[PDB]
Write a protein that binds this ligand. Structure first.
Ligand SMILES: *[C@@H]1O[C@H](CO)[C@@H](O[C@@H]2O[C@H](CO)[C@@H](O[C@@H]3O[C@H](CO[C@H]4O[C@H](CO)[C@@H](O)[C@H](O)[C@@H]4O)[C@@H](O)[C@H](O[C@H]4O[C@H](CO)[C@@H](O)[C@H](O)[C@@H]4O[C@H]4O[C@H](CO)[C@@H](O)[C@H](O)[C@@H]4O)[C@@H]3O)[C@H](O)[C@H]2NC(C)=O)[C@H](O)[C@H]1NC(C)=O
Ligand SMILES: *[C@@H]1O[C@H](CO)[C@@H](O[C@@H]2O[C@H](CO)[C@@H](O[C@@H]3O[C@H](CO[C@H]4O[C@H](CO)[C@@H](O)[C@H](O)[C@@H]4O)[C@@H](O)[C@H](O[C@H]4O[C@H](CO)[C@@H](O)[C@H](O)[C@@H]4O[C@H]4O[C@H](CO)[C@@H](O)[C@H](O)[C@@H]4O)[C@@H]3O)[C@H](O)[C@H]2NC(C)=O)[C@H](O)[C@H]1NC(C)=O
Ligand SMILES: *[C@@H]1O[C@H](CO)[C@@H](O[C@@H]2O[C@H](CO)[C@@H](O)[C@H](O)[C@H]2NC(C)=O)[C@H](O)[C@H]1NC(C)=O
Ligand SMILES: *[C@@H]1O[C@H](CO)[C@@H](O[C@@H]2O[C@H](CO)[C@@H](O)[C@H](O)[C@H]2NC(C)=O)[C@H](O)[C@H]1NC(C)=O
Ligand SMILES: *[C@@H]1O[C@H](CO)[C@@H](O[C@@H]2O[C@H](CO)[C@@H](O)[C@H](O)[C@H]2NC(C)=O)[C@H](O)[C@H]1NC(C)=O
Ligand SMILES: *[C@@H]1O[C@H](CO)[C@@H](O)[C@H](O)[C@H]1NC(C)=O
Ligand SMILES: *[C@@H]1O[C@H](CO)[C@@H](O)[C@H](O)[C@H]1NC(C)=O
Ligand SMILES: *[C@@H]1O[C@H](CO)[C@@H](O)[C@H](O)[C@H]1NC(C)=O
Ligand SMILES: *[C@@H]1O[C@H](CO)[C@@H](O)[C@H](O)[C@H]1NC(C)=O
Ligand SMILES: *[C@@H]1O[C@H](CO)[C@@H](O)[C@H](O)[C@H]1NC(C)=O
Ligand SMILES: *[C@@H]1O[C@H](CO)[C@@H](O)[C@H](O)[C@H]1NC(C)=O
Lengths: 445, 136, 137, 436, 446, 134
């Protein structure tokens, strides 16, 4: 009968929680150039020394598939993106009948029909005057009316706006930081599965810097973990779930657009300009990406070796290319140099287990796959562009309804943007600090 | 060393109560250009205010409870409510030298509201009795 | 039963003081169902609700500060050393704690409230100074 | 002798003005969408014994908030939808003379409207009600609001069907409810129950005759700010509902015309079958009894031997001269003169339909109500009347009353009359027998 | 312990330099009447009818008007209110059309030849398939020739123009800046305070004196007047790259007018969208102008120079000259009177070398209000005629530091940066924050 | 007379502690109101100002709580002076000096002192908990 309730305040315990995290940057992104979406948003620098605290003996359960931080990042990016277009020029006046031809001059056969030379009647700065102008368009954005009359692809569905010519969408790394009263716990287990208990937990103020890189099928410029290739999925057994594969070595991919572009500016209203693609200088060649087979064949062999752990050591593992659907799903959607590429990856998934040039299409009117109903027009970039990126992971799915268990088929798939962030945020969890608690002691008032 | 504990026994962890207490409020004022830019983001600005207002409301809620229970101003408060063996049938060495607070909470979370109600009742009676004794 | 004591004897109502006090700061008991992200778009309603919440906090704190200054922090039924002046209510003690409720009583006091508060503040200032010198011995 | 004691948690309140919040398959219902914070389904009413409190419905700020919130929600619901500016063109109209159950109520108008392309046009046609079409300078017509305001299209998914809503106090505040029988909106009352939220109130919009409200307990209650002053409205609440059956008998179809990129306009298409008059049926015996009860109660305030006459409405626009009724998604303007034509000592009311609505929240903006396919049938409860005195006469022998209203706040005042908002003031002081 | 322990005090009267958010307070009576004034409808906290001021005995406080964050606060608030006043009104994009015009030749004095143009154009009506031909008058500064009789509005290639709201007033009304709880404003009362350094008569206030948000360049109008002498303030004095703000201790009265009797016509351009055009002038057409008493101005500069010499030398020649090149908004005396914009030529005021003056004025309707570039406002015309009476309270001058020697200094009108018009009123105030905790030793122990 | 004691000596100024203490929560008491809800930016800036004023107030109250001075304007401790913080006698500290001057004199030791006060209070509570066990 001698034990009494003692109330304590400042007890080091926590509970799972969902809150709003704020973004932070390295300062330098804003200090130097600004004029980009993430430097402008992330106005608060991180601490120069965001030292983590190791928690001795702490075991905590993580679940990357239910991680609220991922859902927030998705929402924040879309909102940021929209607010970056809001102030710029609407391109409504371009939704007219166009008079187009085949370009023809200096085209390698692989590029025949890819570009069109279109003339049209657009307004000038004065309401009562018009001008006849012309520009090049990529075939993918131009749809035939009814053989010379064409419409822009967005005219019957969506509003179209011009992306701001001075704003970069470069994926500058950002950090998510907790508000007071909250903490971010992270798993330091090098082989963490994506779910379940982790016995190596530290507490941080901010996450590591994450580059908000947008792509589909092949994940670019992320983490390579540390020791081994890890295959993780919400279910594994259920083929309907995406499998996120994290590589332990990167594969370098070299992408280019070889055509030397120029640009012309057309005045379309008081204070407004339209950026049009001008004539190509020199030869017209196809855009493409190079993957070295020397590394790619070994990389897939490693994936298969690990993949077998869930499927059988005598099972046939087949890689195959994508299924049908929009280019955002069926090809490697890739945003680089300020232009949008849609690269054909079938040359990468053509093997059965027990240099590679990928041609690429270029598109300017983009229904950014965040939603349908608002199209973005990407202004052209002068000169030529080159990108060198690190492939750090893959998103694969399985074919259900297989004839038998002897053979499993893996294809590039997914493309939902959440999985491009889930793969970096998989090790972080947000918890709320709860300072009150009680315990029996031997003291009485 | 904010969560420098939770990997130590309940007894050892009593030495970090001030550190945990000072995470709120000081950690808010401390937050301290384009901060002007962000005022143009109406939804974002509202969400941030809601987070700050809420953090304050949570802080005050807990302080009011310490007030009600007669533990205001203390980090460690002895009370007149006896411990029930059914809330947890464990001895002092057993919990103070082995459990880590996180574990303890998980085991007695079912009695939280019961205990809080008891703490309020004891304080109510004590305050009245003292005033009646003060008046000769 | 938040205002349940409104119809009761002033001395009986003294037993519900924690009921009324607790609900002045209801806490975070109101729940957010999923919508919510929707309600944030109603910019004006967003601002009005924040104003309402901020004010409730400010009112709470102002009252607590006064109890602090007057030396009644942490108490619900605190007495002090300011004597009662009969002009404030010319009735005896037995005519106050009974035969009346808390409503009515505040009308009896009316404008004397400002006077009382000033007296309470100065008294505490003197009490603290006296303790400060006692601790010097 | 006695000492000052400071108390905290004292159950004492004062009149106050604060902001209340609205708590409330219908994913496109306005009331459902923007008021989504459900409360405990079992409100806890506290009876306050020995408590008397003063109410005044005419100075009740809960009415002003309901009014403002409704306007704001209304405007937000239309905020994201297509403007109909491209329809304000010269129209070429005919008289729609096929199968008219005899005329001139509808017009069939053709016009030149753009397609999705800036450089192409299409010839389209649609039906309009005569009330929304005004002649230029005999074939050429304009939409009625072209010289005043932009017309926007109502979002053709969105419903305004009233869902009872509840106004709830923020912490630190309480709502007092007067349950006294025969309470006439002003003065002290003694039931005074204490609630967290009001009863559910349907934000029903109407003029002249109030629909779907409460029924005054067991007697007809006549409420007024002054009674004597003929510039004031009289709100009469009935002890029985009067049933009214309304219809729009024409079988409509709908056209959808591309008006711009990503945008569609909803036009009224051809009518299938006979073209007939919209109307409302008020039970005739019930209406006769209802007025007799009103007259009995009304008479006691003017004289026990005086005569009461009812007469129809006066001047002003349709919004005030007719019974403005919003049901089934359409706007009806019913002629009530057949209800107010008698001297004391099924009734079919024809109704007009309008599509471009200067909803009287304000002037300068207009909503286009898209047409609804099929036919509409509405059944509703008449729960009260708004009347005015036809003053200026000195012949005290007979008082004359006419339908009035049009100021939307009166429709809210009639439900919120029993509620008052107060703030809680927890500190107080009283003498005791001790000192610290 | 040597008998001393740390005693903690709360409520200690100590303050530190700070930057915070201030709020806009008002008279609240002139404001009830002036229902459409931009700074009245948006400045609602009533001031205390009897504002308090507490003199602080034995307090020396360091002030610096050139680093005063209240200036940035006033600047951004004015810009914001300006933007929110125009936001709800009609865009005049539909008027950016080819205009056809000739010169107004009826009843023109010589000074007005070529100043007004009579332009007709094809404009929309409430129906999209109809057009109307209308005409209006324009000032030659608003209209640019298209390359014989064809013209466009000057803003047609750089920005859409918004019509100023016809009922909104921009009349300066006194504004009080007030601190939030936890903050205080320290006011410097020292006579002849030059903008920097310690001040010995310091008092605490809750709100500043009322400041009229008067916008002008070159000559500061309707400000505070100095009490003892002319005070010359500058961040550096020596550095020729900075402005010199001169506060007078005597006002100079200036009388400005726009003598032409104008009319106005309302043209519907769309569905409730109205454009206000300038119609025919009734009576003779004459040039707008301002009158400055010659003797008063001559004596006033005398006083300024006497003080200016203290920094340049008794044997140094001081010369005044007119403004340099640049846009009218920075080379002439711009100001807003009655809602119309004057750009007056001040060269007649600054032409002397030391050991009634009529200033012609131009009127412009398209205003590149300098809050920023890339936006424009159209000022509706004012019917009838206007007369302005105002007080010159100070000058904005610069030194011609291009190439010189000890023989002579040259001063000429400058400015154009509106923040200097506010430094001239806010130089006396500093914002500090209160920090109630502190500790001190004492003989007392628990 | 809110800062009226600013030129007074530290000792004399101890008599106005409630004048300054009341400012933080009384000052905040500060057609219209509704019109300004349209100025979204002012809405946010003013709410930020009020929220911060509350956060700062509470931060200071939390410290008084932690140090064991809750509810007091003046409190004694068990933490001694080191004589390095200020090498002065009481007759030249409480008199012949104002609080503004004093704050500058010892501003370098503010964090040191606060840390010591915290540790002392924690030890004191620990020794009430065991004492109540006997
Ligand atoms: C995975 O990670 C890699 C590595 O970070 C990333 O590749 C890099 O992408 C960036 C952005 O696309 C590339 O940066 C551009 O490089 C070009 C070429 O410059 C060369 O010559 C200069 C000479 O001084 C060297 O310093 C430089 O290193 C190169 O050798 C620059 O021209 C680009 O500058 C423009 O953008 C800047 C953005 O801040 C502007 O500040 C700058 O003023 C330029 O914009 C203006 O001029 C343009 C004309 O050139 C015009 O089009 C614009 O509208 C505007 O007017 C820029 O610095 C970088 O070189 C890539 N690195 C490698 C090795 O290739 C991958 O993209 C990333 N993968 C994915 C999927 O995200
Ligand atoms: C005072 O209070 C009373 C109630 O106490 C209230 O009366 C009720 O009003 C509601 C709303 O107007 C009425 O609800 C509608 O009823 C019709 C009738 O349909 C009957 O027949 C069909 C046959 O197929 C049955 O399936 C049905 O159950 C009924 O027996 C429905 O048709 C209405 O639904 C349509 O509109 C909805 C709008 O959201 C759509 O979601 C729904 O899918 C339907 O739309 C389709 O049909 C339309 C044509 O009918 C067409 O235009 C659309 O494009 C689409 O194809 C709806 O359920 C309810 O019946 C009334 N009660 C009574 C007894 O009459 C009063 O209104 C209130 N007073 C005031 C002033 O508000
Ligand atoms: C659509 O526009 C055409 C072109 O203006 C209209 O046809 C003209 O009508 C006028 C009489 O008002 C005739 O004098 C012209 O000769 C006609 N032009 C042509 C090319 O036929 C037509 O009436 C308009 N239609 C509608 C429904 O408004
Ligand atoms: C119903 O309303 C009437 C007012 O219309 C209230 O009557 C007033 O009563 C007060 C005092 O009792 C008088 O001073 C007013 O002159 C009365 N006005 C009229 C028009 O008679 C009446 O009190 C209300 N009902 C109740 C029960 O009070
Ligand atoms: C500023 O300094 C002066 C001089 O030390 C102070 O003046 C003395 O104040 C005492 C107060 O008890 C009076 O009895 C003396 O007669 C005053 N002396 C003179 C010469 O006037 C003054 O109080 C100080 N200011 C403040 C705010 O403390
Ligand atoms: C490239 O274009 C030029 C004309 O600009 C032409 O003379 C030349 O032959 C073309 N080259 C090829 C490969 O078609
Ligand atoms: C890894 O995830 C799979 C999903 O099927 C699960 O069955 C397995 O138990 C998890 N492994 C660990 C160590 O958590
Ligand atoms: C390269 O591909 C062959 C099949 O063509 C395969 O047998 C071999 O193991 C692969 N190399 C590596 C390193 O995996
Ligand atoms: C009138 O009725 C006839 C059927 O006899 C029908 O064919 C015709 O379309 C109707 N006209 C209308 C709907 O006005
Ligand atoms: C058409 O309607 C007008 C207006 O009601 C009427 O004057 C005219 O006689 C009608 N003509 C026919 C043939 O219906
Ligand atoms: C009319 O004005 C133009 C431009 O100011 C000028 O060139 C022309 O000579 C004028 N014609 C006259 C003054 O007759």
């Amino acid at each position: 009968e001698n034990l009494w309730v003692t109330v304590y305040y400042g007890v080091p315990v926590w509970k799972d929680a969902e809150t709003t995290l704020f973004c932070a940057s390295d300062a330098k992104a804003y200090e130097t150039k600004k004029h980009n979406v993430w430097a402008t948003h992330c106005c608060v620098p991180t601490d120069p020394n965001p030292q983590e605290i190791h928690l001795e003996n702490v075991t905590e359960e993580f679940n990357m598939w239910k991680n609220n931080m991922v859902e927030q990042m998705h929402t924040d990016i879309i909102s940021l993106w929209d607010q970056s277009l809001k102030p710029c020029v609407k391109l409504t006046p371009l939704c007219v009948t166009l008079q187009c031809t085949n370009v023809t001059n200096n085209i390698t056969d692989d590029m025949r029909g890819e570009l069109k030379n279109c003339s049209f009647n657009m307004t000038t700065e004065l309401r009562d005057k018009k001008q006849k102008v012309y520009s090049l368009f990529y075939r993918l954005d131009v749809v035939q009316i009814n053989n010379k009359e064409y419409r822009l692809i967005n005219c019957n569905t969506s509003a179209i706006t011009q992306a701001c010519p001075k704003v970069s969408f470069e994926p500058i790394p950002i950090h998510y930081c907790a508000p007071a009263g909250f903490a971010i716990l992270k798993c330091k287990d090098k082989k963490f599965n994506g779910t379940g208990p982790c016995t190596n937990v530290s507490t941080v103020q901010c996450t590591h810097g994450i580059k908000p890189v947008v792509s589909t099928q092949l994940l670019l410029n992320g983490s390579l973990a540390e020791e081994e290739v890890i295959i993780r999925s919400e279910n594994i057994t259920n083929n309907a779930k995406n499998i996120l594969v994290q590589l332990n070595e990167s594969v370098q991919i070299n992408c280019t657009r070889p055509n030397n572009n120029t640009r012309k500016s057309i005045r379309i209203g008081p204070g407004q300009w339209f950026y049009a693609t001008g004539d190509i200088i020199g030869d017209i060649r196809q855009a493409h990406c190079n993957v070295s087979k020397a590394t790619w064949n070994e990389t897939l062999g490693k994936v298969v070796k690990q993949l077998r752990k869930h499927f059988g050591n005598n099972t046939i593992i087949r890689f195959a290319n994508s299924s049908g659907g929009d280019l955002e799903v069926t090809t490697h959607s890739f945003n680089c140099g300020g232009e949008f590429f849609y690269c054909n990856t079938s040359g990468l998934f053509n093997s059965t287990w027990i240099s590679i040039t990928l041609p690429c299409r270029i598109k300017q009117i983009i229904n950014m796959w965040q939603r349908i109903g608002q199209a973005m027009y990407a202004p052209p970039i002068q000169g030529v562009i080159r990108c060198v990126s690190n492939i750090t992971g893959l998103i694969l799915t399985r074919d259900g309804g297989s004839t038998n268990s002897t053979t499993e088929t893996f294809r590039p798939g997914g493309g939902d943007m959440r999985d491009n962030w889930r793969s970096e945020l998989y090790k972080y969890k947000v918890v709320k600090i709860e300072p009150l608690g009680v315990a029996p002691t031997r003291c009485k008032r | 060393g904010f969560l420098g504990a939770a990997g130590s026994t309940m007894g050892a962890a009593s030495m970090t109560l001030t550190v945990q207490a000072r995470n709120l409020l000081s950690g808010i004022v401390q937050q301290q250009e384009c901060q002007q830019h962000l005022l143009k983001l109406t939804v974002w600005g509202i969400k941030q205010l809601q987070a700050r207002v809420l953090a304050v409301e949570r802080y005050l809620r807990d302080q009011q409870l310490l007030g009600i229970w007669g533990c205001s101003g203390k980090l460690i408060c002895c009370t007149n409510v006896p411990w029930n063996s059914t809330w947890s049938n464990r001895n002092l060495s057993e919990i103070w030298d082995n459990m880590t607070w996180l574990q303890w909470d998980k085991e007695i979370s079912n009695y939280t509201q019961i205990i809080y109600g008891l703490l309020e009742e004891s304080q109510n009676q004590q305050e009245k009795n003292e005033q009646d004794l003060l008046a000769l």
